[PDB]
Amino acid sequence: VQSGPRTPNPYASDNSSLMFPILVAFGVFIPTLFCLC
Amino acid sequence: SQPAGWQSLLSFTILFLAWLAGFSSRLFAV
């Protein structure tokens, strides 16, 4: 009836994986503000 | 940079913020 102990979240690791997507967003934004010329 | 374009942008922004302040002050019962 009772399930058991919960599972630790295997999602990510700090100082690399959390900021990687945000940095991808920034790195796309800057060349977009280059197509002026 | 014409002051007319910035004047109209300021008007649009202040109307949008008035909308948002009217919508946000009416959620103290929700």
Place this chain on the structure above:
Amino acid sequence: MITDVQLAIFANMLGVSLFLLVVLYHYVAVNNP
């Protein structure tokens, strides 16, 4: 979930910003007809 204090602070700050933008609009329009 938002609390009452957070939303009260938000409403106060938003009202103050509104009236600052009103006075800024009057300044701009008067100075540059």
Place this chain on the structure above:
Amino acid sequence: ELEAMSRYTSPVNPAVFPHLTVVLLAIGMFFTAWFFVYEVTSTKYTRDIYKELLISLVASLFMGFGVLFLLLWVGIYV
């Protein structure tokens, strides 16, 4: 079997749904504000249609992805 499979992870770490919303929503707003300004200070002859379509496309792209992440942070899970 259920023994040879791996437990399913989300493609984006959930704890970075908020930080990735604002960044993908501020930029969008910025681009939209650049479009609106451009349409107020431009006469009919001077307006270029390609810059209009391009800034429309980029602003819509970032705004759409930001709206999705906002929609998914509050707990709708589209």
